[PDB]
Amino acid sequence: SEESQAFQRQLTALIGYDVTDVSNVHDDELEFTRRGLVTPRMAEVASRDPKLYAMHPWVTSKPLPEYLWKKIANNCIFIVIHRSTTSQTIKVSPDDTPGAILQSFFTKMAKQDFVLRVCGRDEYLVGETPIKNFQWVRHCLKNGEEIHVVLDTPPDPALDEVRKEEWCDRKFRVKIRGIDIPVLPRNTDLTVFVEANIQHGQQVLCQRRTSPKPFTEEVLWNVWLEFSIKIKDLPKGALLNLQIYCRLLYYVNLLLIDHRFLLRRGEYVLHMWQISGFNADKLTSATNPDKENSMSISILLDNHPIARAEMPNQLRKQLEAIIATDPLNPLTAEDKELLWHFRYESLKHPKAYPKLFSSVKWGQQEIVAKTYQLLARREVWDQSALDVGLTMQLLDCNFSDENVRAIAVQKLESLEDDDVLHYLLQLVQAVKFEPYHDSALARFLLKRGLRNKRIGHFLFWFLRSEIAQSRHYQQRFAVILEAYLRGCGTAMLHDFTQQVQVIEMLQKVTLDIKSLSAEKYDVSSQVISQLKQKLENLQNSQLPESFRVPYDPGLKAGALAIEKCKVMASKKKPLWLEFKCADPTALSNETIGIIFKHGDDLRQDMLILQILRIMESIWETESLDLCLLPYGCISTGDKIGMIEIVKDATTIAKIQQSTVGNTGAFKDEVLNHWLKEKSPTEEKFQAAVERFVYSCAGYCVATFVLGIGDRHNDNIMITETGNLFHIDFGHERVPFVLTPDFLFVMGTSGKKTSPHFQKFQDICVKAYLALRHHTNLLIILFSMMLMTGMPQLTSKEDIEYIRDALTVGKNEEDAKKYFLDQIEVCRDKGWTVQFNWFLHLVL
Numbered sequence: 048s049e050e051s052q053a054f055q056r057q058l059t060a061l062i063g064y065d066v067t068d069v070s071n072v073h074d075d076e077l078e079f080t081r082r083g084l085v086t087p088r089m090a091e092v093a094s095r096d097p098k099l100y101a102m103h104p105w106v107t108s109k110p111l112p113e114y115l116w117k118k119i120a121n122n123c124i125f126i127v128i129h130r131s132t133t134s135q136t137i138k139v140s141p142d143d144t145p146g147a148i149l150q151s152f153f154t155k156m157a158k159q160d161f162v163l164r165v166c167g168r169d170e171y172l173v174g175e176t177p178i179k180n181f182q183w184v185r186h187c188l189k190n191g192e193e194i195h196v197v198l199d200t201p202p203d204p205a206l207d208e209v210r211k212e213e214w215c216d217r218k219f220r221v222k223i224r225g226i227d228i229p230v231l232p233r234n235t236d237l238t239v240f241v242e243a244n245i246q247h248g249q250q251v252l253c254q255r256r257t258s259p260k261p262f263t264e265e266v267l268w269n270v271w272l273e274f275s276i277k278i279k280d281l282p283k284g285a286l287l288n289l290q291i292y293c294r295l296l297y298y299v300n301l302l303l304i305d306h307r308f309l310l311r312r313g314e315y316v317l318h319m320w321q322i323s324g325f326n327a328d329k330l331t332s333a334t335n336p337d338k339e340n341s342m343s344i345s346i347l348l349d350n351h352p353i354a355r356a357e358m359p360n361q362l363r364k365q366l367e368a369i370i371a372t373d374p375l376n377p378l379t380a381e382d383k384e385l386l387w388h389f390r391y392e393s394l395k396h397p398k399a400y401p402k403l404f405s406s407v408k409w410g411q412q413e414i415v416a417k418t419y420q421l422l423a424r425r426e427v428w429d430q431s432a433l434d435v436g437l438t439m440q441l442l443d444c445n446f447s448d449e450n451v452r453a454i455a456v457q458k459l460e461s462l463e464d465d466d467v468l469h470y471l472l473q474l475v476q477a478v479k480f481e482p483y484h485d486s487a488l489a490r491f492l493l494k495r496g497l498r499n500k501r502i503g504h505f506l507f508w509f510l511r512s513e514i515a516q517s518r519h520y521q522q523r524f525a526v527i528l529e530a531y532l533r534g535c536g537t538a539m540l541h542d543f544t545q546q547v548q549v550i551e552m553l554q555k556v557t558l559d560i561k562s563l564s565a566e567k568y569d570v571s572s573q574v575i576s577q578l579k580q581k582l583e584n585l586q587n588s589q590l591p592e593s594f595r596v597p598y599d600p601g602l603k604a605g606a607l608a609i610e611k612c613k614v615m616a617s618k619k620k621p622l623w624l625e626f627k628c629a630d631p632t633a634l635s636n637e638t639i640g641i642i643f644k645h646g647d648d649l650r651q652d653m654l655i656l657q658i659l660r661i662m663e664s665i666w667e668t669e670s671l672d673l674c675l676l677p678y679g680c681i682s683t684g685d686k687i688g689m690i691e692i693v694k695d696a697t698t699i700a701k702i703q704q705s706t707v708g709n710t711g712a713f714k715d716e717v718l719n720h721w722l723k724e725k726s727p728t729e730e731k732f733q734a735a736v737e738r739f740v741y742s743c744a745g746y747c748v749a750t751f752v753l754g755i756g757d758r759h760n761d762n763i764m765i766t767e768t769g770n771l772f773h774i775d776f777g778h779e780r781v782p783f784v785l786t787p788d789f790l791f792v793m794g795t796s797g798k799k800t801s802p803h804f805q806k807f808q809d810i811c812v813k814a815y816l817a818l819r820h821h822t823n824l825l826i827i828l829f830s831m832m833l834m835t836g837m838p839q840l841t842s843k844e845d846i847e848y849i850r851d852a853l854t855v856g857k858n859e860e861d862a863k864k865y866f867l868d869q870i871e872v873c874r875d876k877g878w879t880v881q882f883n884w885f886l887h888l889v890l
């Protein structure tokens with residue numbers, strides 16, 4: 048039970064979906080999975096160290112990079128320590144442990160055990176880890192900032208308390224009985240039929256259609272569709288995909304083999320998703336909840352159980368070629384038979400695996416069988432160094448096999464949380480391609496999140512984002528999330544509860560404002576009054592005292608700085624909100640500034656940011672830094688989220704709007720002066736020029752590779768201190784934005800050259816060829832990003848942009864060249880397509 052039922056309500060309300068509901072299910076897979084996961088939760092709950100769990104020390108084994116060693120010119124590092132306006136700086140060796148450092152502190156002073164928190168944050172410096180390898184530290188040094196730690200006592204683990212828990216040879220066939228809707232779309236008498244497909248990870252195996260019939264609110268074939276595949280020859284996670292044409296109006300899927308390895312049997316009335324008007328919402332096993340409006344379709348099943356010599360020379364080359372080839376390059380039948388026949392060779396190359404395991408006739412009993420024995424002798428794969436790109440490839444929509452996928456997930460287990468985080472989003476998305484609810488991957492995220500509060504935090508938001516936005520996959524995710532919450536332990540279950548109230552409260556307001564200035568560019572006086580009055584309404588009796596900032600979970604936001612809050616001047620109407628730092632131990636009066644937007648799909652924005660981070664970290668692997676600024680952004684509901692405000696930055700646009708703010712002339716020298724005026728010391732200035740030349744370079748390359756490079760002035764921003772950065776990626780061409788205003792700071796003005804520009808093209812090209820060394824990773828993350836992040840897309844041409852862009856199948860000369868040209872286009876045009884934004888106002 049009873050006090051165990053409030054807890055359940057608490058969950059659901061934390062989740063945004065009632066997983067005890069059963070009305071949109073035609074079997075128990077979810078309930079079963081909810082049970083399946085108790086053990087792996089308990090298992091990970093039990094084996095987590097209380098004191099390290101409660102402090103979630105954020106840390107990396109990666110070597111410290113060259114450019115940050117450069118920043119320590121004394122093999123020694125200063126650490127200001129504090130106890131209550133009593134402090135001292137300490138010189139400390141890059142290899143020192145915290146406890147160690149405690150030794151030499153106790154030593155210094157007085158002439159039991161406390162811990163080193165970061166002033167202002169919920170961030171601790173604990174564990175047998177050398178300080179060089181704590182993230183916060185590395186970050187401080189990047190930014191030429193000091194390090195301010197306060198001494199306090201560890202947090203009682205009691206607060207992490209988890210609640211007590213108390214838990215044949217026949218050909219295949221299917222009766223298409225008929226279909227129904229209530230109300231008809233376009234209305235004039237068109238024609239309609241049912242296509243039933245037998246799928247295995249978008250491999251289609253067999254396919255049948257019905258004779259067509261007049262599209263009416265009821266259509267009744269009562270036919271057997273006898274497929275050529277044998278009951279036995281079916282493989283696990285084979286989907287019965289059923290689709291409706293006239294062309295494609297609806298689709299819906301049924302797993303032909305249930306979670307219990309049971310051939311599926313009986314009557315089914317399925318409610319079908321309509322088309323928007325390929326992608327992962329197509330693959331789902333979920334039925335459309337909205338019974339009242341959806342097209343449906345009745346069907347029937349009753350058909351029980353089921354559960355090396357020397358290779359030639361020139362073929363080895365044919366093979367090696369195939370193998371050593373981008374993920375999107377598709378395999379000729381001749382290819383596929385080659386991979387298969389020389390499967391034992393093919394097994395010595397980890398880069399093969401994707402290609403190889405998609406050269407499998409998964410519609411044959413005897414072959415899969417072999418494939419499994421093929422997985423048996425895993426020596427080379429087990430042993431191989433983790434290749435995330437490789438690993439990832441094997442969790443996309445192209446692989447349904449439970450045990451192909453599982454070896455990928457094996458590989459991930461060897462990730463440290465550091466990296467778990469880089470890929471966390473993509474991996475969560477990748478659940479969409481799991482045939483079953485309960486999957487290895489799902490189990491792994493569950494683990495990794497319960498292990499480490501950082502990961503858990505981000506896991507929560509990621510799953511909540513999706514659950515709240517997608518009907519196709521909310522059910523499955525919600526089962527996973529509940530699982531997490533159950534193990535995360537009340538500390539957090541409060542924290543999230545806190546966090547969820549606020550963003551619910553705030554979105555409330557956010558939308559009520561779009562009401563009041565419809566489009567009208569301007570924002571009426573009245574508007575700001577009301578924003579102010581409501582946030583006052585909110586704070587005074589309803590808002591929490593404070594709460595973690597979801598994009599940056601170490602930050603406890605306090606009260607609102609109402610004065611500084613406002614509605615942005617959008618066609619949308621986002622919120623510029625600012626909060627006080629609830630930590631009194633914090634060094635600043637600076638606020639936490641967060642934007643709330645409705646009307647953009649932030650999941651795209653999120654995805655991109657996360658790739659940007661991935662890139663920054665690739666560049667870390669060549670001791671390169673490009674000063675990207677991937678501010679925090681988090682989806683929270685339907686077309687709505689939050690976003691980090693980056694302090695002290697304006698809009699390339701506005702820097703024009705200032706002097707002129709014309710309907711739209713454009714000037715070149717203006718940029719540089721802006722900096723001067725924001726550079727109290729010329730030398731600092733040159734730093735802006737420094738920071739800029741990188742950030743510019745950084746964004747130049749990345750943005751191109753994603754082909755989100757032709758953007759407007761308004762959607763690029765720069766910090767007072769030189770850090771340029773794009774924003775807002777839900778929103779003749781030009782490959783990327785390299786205006787002459789930029790180049791005047793690089794020491795050039797329309798077709799010459801200069802000290803910093805040589806450097807710019809130098810960095811650019813380093814940065815470029817460096818990403819090409821991780822081509823497959825990007826392709827695969829992009830490819831997925833598109834399949835899970837977007838509307839509809841072409842499973843060729845959309846994706847195939849990026850291979851042309853990374854200049855696949857090229858040596859590093861051809862390419863560096865390729866890129867250099869892509870600069871010289873931006874000088875042919877200068878202002879041209881920039882100008883062009885305005886103009887189309889009427890075209």
Ligand SMILES: COc1cc(-c2ccc3nc(NC(C)=O)sc3c2)cnc1OC
Pocket residue numbers: 621642644647649652678690691692693694695696697774775776777
């Ligand atoms: C208009 O909403 C968006 C805003 C931003 C965005 C991101 C960071 C940011 N930082 C800013 N700083 C200042 C001082 O104005 S202003 C600002 C705006 C990024 N994406 C969006 O769309 C999803």
